[PDB]
Amino acid sequence: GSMKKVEAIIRPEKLEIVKKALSDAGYVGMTVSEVKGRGVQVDLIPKVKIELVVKEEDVDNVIDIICENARTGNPGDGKIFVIPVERVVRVRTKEEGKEALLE
Amino acid sequence: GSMKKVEAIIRPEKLEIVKKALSDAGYVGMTVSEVKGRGVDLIPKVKIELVVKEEDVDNVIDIICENARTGNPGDGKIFVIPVERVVRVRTKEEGKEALLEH
Amino acid sequence: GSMKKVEAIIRPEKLEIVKKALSDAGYVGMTVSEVKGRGVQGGIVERYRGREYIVDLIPKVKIELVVKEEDVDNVIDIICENARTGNPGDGKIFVIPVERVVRVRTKEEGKEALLE
Numbered sequence: 142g143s144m145k146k147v148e149a150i151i152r153p154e155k156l157e158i159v160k161k162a163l164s165d166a167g168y169v170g171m172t173v174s175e176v177k178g179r180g181v182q183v184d185l186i187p188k189v190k191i192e193l194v195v196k197e198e199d200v201d202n203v204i205d206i207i208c209e210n211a212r213t214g215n216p217g218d219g220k221i222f223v224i225p226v227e228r229v230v231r232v233r234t235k236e237e238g239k240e241a242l243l244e
Numbered sequence: 245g246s247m248k249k250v251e252a253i254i255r256p257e258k259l260e261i262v263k264k265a266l267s268d269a270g271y272v273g274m275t276v277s278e279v280k281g282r283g284v285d286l287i288p289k290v291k292i293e294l295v296v297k298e299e300d301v302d303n304v305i306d307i308i309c310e311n312a313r314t315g316n317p318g319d320g321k322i323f324v325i326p327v328e329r330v331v332r333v334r335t336k337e338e339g340k341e342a343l344l345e346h
Numbered sequence: 347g348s349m350k351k352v353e354a355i356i357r358p359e360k361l362e363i364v365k366k367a368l369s370d371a372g373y374v375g376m377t378v379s380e381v382k383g384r385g386v387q388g389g390i391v392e393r394y395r396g397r398e399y400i401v402d403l404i405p406k407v408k409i410e411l412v413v414k415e416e417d418v419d420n421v422i423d424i425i426c427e428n429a430r431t432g433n434p435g436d437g438k439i440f441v442i443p444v445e446r447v448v449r450v451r452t453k454e455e456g457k458e459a460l461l462e
């Protein structure tokens with residue numbers, strides 16, 4: 142099928158709630174990085190990047206969950222990007238496609 | 245039309261000048277990460293990521309190259325990656341409307 | 347031809363071996379970052395005094411390499427061979443399309459830009 146990477150750049154204090162909400166909905170595989178982005182308004186400030194690769198059919202749901210749980214109503218809540226992924230491979234089994242996501 | 249992610253891996257001492265040049269040209273939304281590349285083998289680099297309208301890619305690339313170059317090996321590389329969707333977290337706005345920074 | 351980004355999220359203790367193997371096969375241009383990950387099931391379970399506690403996010407390393415499409419299979423083989431342990435949490439590889447590669451110094455593009 143089609144696989145997509147959902148990248149969200151959010152406030153660092155929102156990581157725990159967002160990751161919990163994602164986990165509760167069955168999205169447990171995620172990668173988390175520390176990054177910097179512009180402040181609201183000159184130094185950049187800390188943000189968190191969450192990356193999740195999912196089935197294309199799950200993108201809307203993932204985006205809804207992230208938006209609901211990451212938002213505060215103030216400028217600087219962040220942005221989400223969807224990027225095509227053409228191949229996914231599990232390291233330990235060399236499995237590919239959606240199989241590589243599960244277990 | 246479409247959106248693209250422009251990723252540049254550059255020298256850490258070039259971050260300020262690049263960021264200022266991009267800002268002056270109206271590109272204020274960028275994400276910065278501390279990474280390592282070549283090259284004790286791996287040395288510190290900075291990854292800049294900006295998602296822009298397709299029409300702005302050439303201009304962004306020009307600005308980054310102009311301001312990040314030194315003429316020595318290790319100046320870095322720029323990748324352009326397709327972005328199929330952009331969503332503003334607070335408002336749930338999408339596409340070009342989501343790209344405006346406030 | 348086309349360029350592809352190979353991203354691998356692996357165990358931090360596998361970075362040196364993977365990087366060496368990649369280098370020996372001619373892939374020297376790579377970017378490495380420190381990230382945190384969690385896998386599908388459980389999360390790691392450690393013990394304090396008599397009881398267990400869970401650490402959800404644990405340190406991983408992200409390697410990113412942009413290569414000619416023709417080299418993807420080989421990159422993936424090398425990473426898997428050298429990053430695997432047989433235990434859950436070995437990691438994942440994603441292949442992402444790259445539409446343009448530009449060398450900052452020269453503004454060369456394409457295969458010219460990957461040659462280091």
Ligand SMILES: Nc1ncnc2c1ncn2[C@@H]1O[C@H](COP(=O)(O)OP(=O)(O)O)[C@@H](O)[C@H]1O
Nearest residue numbers: 170171172193194383384385386434435436437
């Ligand atoms: N769907 C996903 N999206 C993004 N990153 C993921 C995803 N699933 C797993 N990862 C990353 O890969 C690492 C290993 O995942 P895990 O499922 O534990 O590996 P394995 O497939 O070997 O069991 C995690 O620590 C995380 O960084």
